[PDB]
Amino acid sequence: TEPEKKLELRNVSDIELYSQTNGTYRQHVSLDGIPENTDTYFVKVKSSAFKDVYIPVASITEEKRNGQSVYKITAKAEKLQQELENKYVDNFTFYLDKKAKEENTNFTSFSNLVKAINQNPSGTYHLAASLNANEVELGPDERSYIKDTFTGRLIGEKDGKNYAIYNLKKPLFENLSGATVEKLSLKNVAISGKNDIGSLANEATNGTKIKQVHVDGVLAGERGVGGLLAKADQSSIAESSFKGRIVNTYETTDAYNIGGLVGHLTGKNASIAKSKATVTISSNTNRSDQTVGGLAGLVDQDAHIQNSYAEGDINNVKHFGKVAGVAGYLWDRTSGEEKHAGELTNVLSDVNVTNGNAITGYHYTGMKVANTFSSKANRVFNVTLEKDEVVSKESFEERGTMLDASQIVSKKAEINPLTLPTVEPLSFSKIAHYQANRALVYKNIEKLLPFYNKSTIVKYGNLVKENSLLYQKELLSAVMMKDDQVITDIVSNKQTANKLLLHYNDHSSEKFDLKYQTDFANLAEYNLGNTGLLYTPNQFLYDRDSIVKEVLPELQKLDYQSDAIRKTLGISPEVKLTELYLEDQFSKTKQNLGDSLKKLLSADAGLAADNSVTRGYLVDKIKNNKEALLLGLTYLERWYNFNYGQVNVKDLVMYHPDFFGKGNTSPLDTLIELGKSGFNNLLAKNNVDTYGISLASQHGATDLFSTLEHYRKVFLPNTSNNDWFKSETKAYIVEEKSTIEEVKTKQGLAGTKYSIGVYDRITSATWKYRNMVLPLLTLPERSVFVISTMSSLGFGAYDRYRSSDHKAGKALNDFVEENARETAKRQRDHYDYWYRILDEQSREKLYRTILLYDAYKFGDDTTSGKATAEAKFDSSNPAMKNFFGPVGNKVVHNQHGAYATGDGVYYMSYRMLDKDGAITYTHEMTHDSDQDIYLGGYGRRNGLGPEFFAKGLLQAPDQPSDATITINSILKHSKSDSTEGSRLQVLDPTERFQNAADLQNYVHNMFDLIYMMEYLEGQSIVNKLSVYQKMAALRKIENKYVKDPADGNEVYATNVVKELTEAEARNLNSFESLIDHNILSAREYQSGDYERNGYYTIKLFAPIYSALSSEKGTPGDLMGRRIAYELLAAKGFKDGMVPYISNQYEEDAKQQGQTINLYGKERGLVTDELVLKKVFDGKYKTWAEFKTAMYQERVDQFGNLKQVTFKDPTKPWPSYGTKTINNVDELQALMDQAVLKDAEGPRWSNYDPEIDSAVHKLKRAIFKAYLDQTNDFRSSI
């Protein structure tokens, strides 16, 4: 008893009735009245299993269901069989209800809510369930859904649990006046508007008791943004919450008060109590009157913020406006009283604000902030004065990391809001032929035969065999012709489509052969290999040409700079569309609109109608939203056209939304939703967030990265996702795994916090610019290079190195490639060294990723050198158009200098690839991660600033011939080069330094030689030098305590070098007196006073006999680095140098009694006396004793064992072969003669007394001779 095959609608979720009476289609949901005279209606059946179907009506009549006017409507189709009351009818017949009396109030639905509120705004209203706001038609330019003044007077939700208004796109109440909204929640807000915007309402004129309002979602505005209310006048918000993005990156130049919770607090009794705002707010001030305050912002007229909490992130581009973490411009425009300004109390803000303060932007004497709190986070300030510099703000109260302990400021957290309408699938049993074991198989074949009878389904399911792979759960398949993902069926149905890719729930792809076997004009059919299973496309092959010939000409006449596009987007005529970066792809999609539009009409919905009503409905839907459709088509094609092998997902993402499941969505609906979503949603910078909002939750995927991983699992299996990333992208990706076997094995894995792959780092969380993946997938040419090494991720452009010497093609590419490879190798060697040195298990934290952008200063071929043309945006350079621009990271980009913002490093002048790029690389890296990486784990010393640990301490030397005490961690220079002359540095890093003990031994031997030479020079000073010569030859260094702006205490000491008096000069007759009187050589150290946080490095050959022990908190800079290197010579890096500069002995000071008020909190003060008494408890009591004992040890050493193989020429251009110093006595005699020669007839003009001075020549010659004697500094005895 084989059954017949007909078309059948199974999972009929709901049914709708549309009309064409007035030439415009509308929803005749209820009150059809008398049966209509003419039948131009068409029934739209929406299914939970597959997409909707439009079928023309046949007969509309009235039938008494139970003595009521319930209209029965029967639709006309080819062979449509409907299973009604367990029996089959040859036509789809359904009943329509009369009406539902729910419009008397606003309980049920939002569509009824906007109607009910407008009737009488005053009163009391309660929500009945979680209601979706997608039912309202938004409006062309409507400000808010509810337009009355005072609305929602008592709109509470205490009737049942808590109900949330899902999917908001405009302000809810527009205005509020003496109206109390309480217990209301907003879950997915996407508000975008030109004027002032507010999630709850735009203004609160009178006493609006806002309570228990938790709003979540992204808010984008231009003229002004607000978290809950754009302006609160005499209104109080208590126990409210916000948790969404806030963007105001537009180039507006007006007075806006953007705030994460409320825009403007102007009321006398206005108050914010027990409120929290997790606002990852980004904004561009561009003018001083602007204010970005997170919580509130520009608080005025005694409005008091009590018990608030700000945990978001503020990313201000420039510090022009008054931006702060928890309170913006507390000052008022009128008289500046302490009380009239505003009040803060018991407030906390652990917000990573940039370019601004952590608490209040404008700080004055009569401060009314009272009690404030802030944690240890980034508060960087780009002063952009001359060379770009970044410093901390220091204008907040500082606390520890125990934020959860101090989280009792706001006890209220959040509430569990009820979910929206589920509308499940509600999934046949007891058919003609049924088997229990093959149940799932039936479902597995239902995706293969849509619009078919259940009898045919089970008949074909019985034909499935166990050997085949149809026994796993199967998602929707994709028909393809030789890896093409064909969509336009009516064009490619006659041609036998080659393959059908079944995508199973195991993320497995299985290819079956297809042939146009059984041919129906109504619905195409196909056969699947030898199994005999039938496959049919989910489209009725209607006349697409009738729709195309109509809709194509109107869509063709559109311009990117037209007013229609600007009106469809949320753009004011002032701001430009350059941030979209879709003009080229706009034109491209404009030319070939035919193919894409045919694919869209093919994948949209199944038209089983020969009557022109359904095709007219499609035409109207495509025409009414032409601008939005075209913008969506441009955006989806621009950023989603990357190939998995030979399969391009431009057709599988834009169309075929059922590949992951969820066939209920329509590819046309998502395009319209993406087009009209706004300017910020279509923005290129938010490509990762746009997917989650528009594309996701509709294609069946959670996020963009999960979608990419899913497509990599389906297409191109058994290959790592990072490998596919490296293969597909057109950026030159260079990865260098460290030489150490342990870290080399650790990096190979795909694990987070350890993988070196570019995709594993970019797509990971806690990455600032994770939106850099989608543009990088779409690079047309080798325009950008990605240097991804351990603990780094540098992005650079090829146009940065293009100049007169390097032509635009062939030469620039090769040069950039080779130099990038060498720079990756150098960075890898540097981090290999730093991994070998650090042995305190802090090396496991050397895997953090921080980007390394370049200058953006692209240079044309006409430019002689590296051009300084900033090229802000919209440049003709392909690197700026296809990258950097889309990954919009507005930088300062000055002419000279490099700065490390704390989360990344930027090269404004030094080119990253050049060999001078690494010497600045190590300095910027020391600036970036000195707090928790290079040090043992404790922060910087309180007095020492960021420039102290970098310029003279942990950095590679600027040049090889530089006579400075530094560690050559990066640059590798072979002996073959001409740089062998005056080496004075380490030959090969990562070979000399294999452990911390190796570094300690190297520094110990270097300072042994340095101490020998310095002792010889000192004995030359006291014994053979006159008084007048002694005065000029030496200087006296002291420590002067000056007031600093950041901290109140003046315990910090600054070094000062001064000309010593003749009275003190005469006393200098003993070498011990040189150490006691604190004297240093004037050959290389200037006579002016030094400053704190300065680029001061101690010279290698310029002696510093002074042991200027600063009994206070901080030694200084010139003396600090010298004593730190001496301590490193005495004890190891972790044992000696780290406790000196990393205040690890701070707590002990707090236990002793040494204290300091740091940022308003009592903290320990690590004095030099404590460091001396803890590092060397029994050996020494004073730093002078330590210096003297080091000198005495070196003396006892060189008095016995010194290598006679010392070869120093110290002669002019005529080559001098060998002086063969055999004992220290001849060397001391030569030093005496050199000092006497330098004293006699001193030039002291044109500066630079380091080359002409004969004393420096002898020291350099001896140093180079001893360095070249052994392989490296191993032992000098």
Residue numbers in the entry: 674 to 1100, 1109 to 1958
Reproduce text from the manuscript describing this model:
The overall structure reveals that S. pneumoniae IgA1P is a multi-domain enzyme, broadly comprised of N-terminal (NTD; residues 665–1070), middle (MD; 1071–1611), and C-terminal domains (CTD; 1612–1963). The active site is formed between the MD and CTD domains that bifurcate the Zn-coordinating residues of the HEMTH motif (residues 1604–1608 in the MD) and a downstream E (E1628 in the CTD).
Thus, we focused our cryo-EM studies on a construct of IgA1P spainning residues 665–1963 that could be excised from its MBP tag and had comparable cleavage to the full-length IgA1P. A defining feature of this S. pneumoniae β-helix is both its relatively small size and the lack of protruding secondary structure elements from within the domain itself. The IgA1P MD and CTD have no structural similarity to any known protein to date, as indicated by the lack of structural similarity using DALI searches. The Zn both polarizes the carbonyl group of the scissile peptide bond and activates the nucleophilic water molecule that is deprotonated by a fourth residue, E1605 (E143 in thermolysin). Thus, it is the NTD that repositions from a “closed” state in the absence of substrate to an “open” state allowing for binding of the IgA1 hinge region.
